[PDB]
């Protein structure tokens, strides 16, 4: 009865939303606008990625290679491995650190998947949506005025 209850919850949830769970099988995958993942050039030529560039690049490379292998007609080993790697990288991009060890880079620093921009304490939902620097502002040290 209880196992039915918890299952009963999500199934009716989909039934009442009328949302047809297909949203779990993600076909054509959307790409976030370029400016939200800036490639700023710090003066001196040193470019600055945003680490969403790198993850997106990984997914795109693996998708291109998968398409290529499909056209060639590689044995089931290679095609299935590459589909596995697509799935792995899409999963990494939508969250890095889940379903296995984090996908890292230089300095063995874990990357910043879209989720790590919308989770924990450094996501928008626990940060700059709390406090904002404001223009028309100042500060200074205070003294007592027994004349005002």
């Amino acid at each position: 009865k209880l196992r039915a209850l918890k299952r009963l919850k999500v199934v009716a949830a989909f039934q009442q939303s009328g949302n047809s769970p297909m949203g779990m099988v993600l076909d054509a995958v959307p790409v976030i606008p370029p400016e939200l993942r800036p490639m700023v050039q710090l003066d001196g030529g040193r470019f600055a990625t945003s680490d969403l560039n790198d993850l997106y690049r990984r997914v795109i490379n693996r998708n291109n290679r998968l398409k290529r292998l499909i056209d060639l007609g590689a044995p089931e080993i290679i095609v299935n491995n590459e589909k596995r790697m697509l799935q792995e990288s899409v999963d990494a991009l939508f969250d890095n650190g889940r379903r296995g060890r984090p996908v890292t880079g230089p300095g063995n620093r874990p990357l910043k998947s879209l989720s790590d921009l919308l989770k924990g304490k450094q996501g928008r939902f626990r940060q700059n949506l709390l406090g904002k620097r404001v223009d028309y502002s100042g500060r200074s040290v205070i003294v007592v005025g027994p004349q005002l």
């Binding site: 993600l26 490639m39 969250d95």
Partner: protein, 141 residues
């Protein structure tokens, strides 16, 4: 939306279908290219393509034919970049037509496995089905 107001009265979340996705996108990225190494301009059909994602320069197309406001809302017939303001790159999205289907990581692995309940399979069992390590019979007579 594309055009916004302060009359926002309902923020409604909900999973998105790919049918809704290839109607969001203003183009499709297909090449893993960020910016040319020598001229430092975005690539065509890359991850920064101005045709897909809008100009980097205010009211200028890529090849420089149209370079002023009087040409706005139009698309230059040779480089294909729609001449407009250069903050659309904040808002225009792309999509990627995959060659094979793929599944999420949020509605599957996150405890409890929403898919795991949905199709009536345990999480570990599914982690062998959607990572290509076990067949599945879809129908039979």
């Amino acid at each position: 939306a594309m055009l916004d107001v302060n009359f926002f009265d309902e923020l409604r979340i909900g999973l998105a279908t790919a049918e809704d996705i290839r109607q969001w996108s203003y183009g499709e990225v297909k090449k893993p290219e960020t910016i040319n190494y020598r001229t430092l301009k975005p690539e065509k059909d890359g991850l920064f393509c101005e045709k897909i994602f809008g100009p980097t320069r205010d009211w200028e197309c890529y090849c420089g034919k149209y370079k002023r406001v009087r040409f706005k809302g139009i698309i230059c017939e040779r480089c294909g970049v729609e001449v407009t303001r250069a903050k659309v790159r904040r808002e225009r999205m792309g999509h990627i037509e995959l060659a094979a289907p793929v599944t999420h990581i949020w509605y599957f692995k996150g405890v409890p496995s929403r898919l795991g309940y949905l199709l009536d399979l345990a999480p570990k069992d599914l982690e062998k089905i959607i990572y290509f390590a076990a067949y599945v019979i879809t129908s039979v007579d």
